């Protein structure tokens with residue numbers, strides 16, 4: 001590896017560790033913002049477009065209900081998410097701008113990316129050409145090189161978590177399953193189509209699960225559907241552990257070769273997890289046309305610029321029932337979230 005790359009990652013780790021050891025806390029409050037629209041909603045949290053009342057800036061505010069986080073056994077995961085997000089800094093990671101908590105909720109105020117989810121664009125176009133998929137894949141390779149060098153595993157790679165920004169570049173969002181891991185970890189988490197075999201088999205697993213998920217993502221970007229698709233999770237899991245995959249004839253030979261090495265059931269043989277680490281991926285023939293430095297510096301023209309009218313446009317996100325942000329008169333779960 002070139003010394004310029006080693007010195008970049010060494011500085012990246014130094015800066016991450018300083019924030020990791022002394023996390024920021026309580027840097028805004030709810031009534032500093034106007035609520036605009038719900039952008040997404042789930043079991044214990046929502047994401048809302050908000051506007052800062054003084055600056056007029058738009059943000060995506062992730063709101064987690066503390067009581068529901070506790071009930072769904074996500075305490076450690078939510079503390080991971082905020083502690084990691086306030087400590088990282090990389091061009092293709094959505095930036096955390098503020099965080100705070102109140103009697104009822106936890107709040108993470110993120111930069112708003114109006115272009116929408118890759119998922120929507122992929123489903124609307126059908127599939128991406130290999131150059132298009134390769135542009136996005138290269139950004140994920142660099143992002144995982146950065147995260148893994150900090151001993152972080154991401155564990156939620158899927159098209160819904162990749163937002164497309166105003167320049168057509170990727171911004172990775174949702175660190176709900178990200179974790180600082182030296183060695184192995186054991187939690188069952190992730191969306192079924194993207195789970196590595198060693199997760200399904202309840203093994204102690206490591207950062208190699210992110211490289212497996214990259215193989216699933218590249219396949220899905222280039223085919224339009226994921227490689228182990230089936231109607232129920234149990235059938236998906238059987239396909240994942242089987243060690244076989246069917247490639248569309250339109251895939252290039254180089255793409256198939258890369259995917260066989262990322263979708264390697266044996267984690268000890270999987271690209272990204274060998275002695276040369278990420279460089280087996282970066283040096284693969286499928287990436288021969290990729291200028292890694294130019295991607296990082298955002299100097300490559302993107303294949304596609306999302307259509308939107310301005311920083312407040314929500315047209316690339318969906319419609320959800322608009323629900324209250326209620327804040328109880330009494331503190332809930334104060335002890336569990338002391339460090340948030």
Ligand SMILES: NC[C@H]1O[C@H](Cc2cc(-c3ccccc3)on2)CC[C@@H]1O
Nearest residue numbers: 004005008009142143145146293296297
């Ligand atoms: N001025 C020269 C350039 O050199 C450095 C570029 C760079 C980036 C990375 C990297 C390595 C792994 C993952 C992601 C990125 O390694 N070297 C930094 C500034 C500038 O872009």
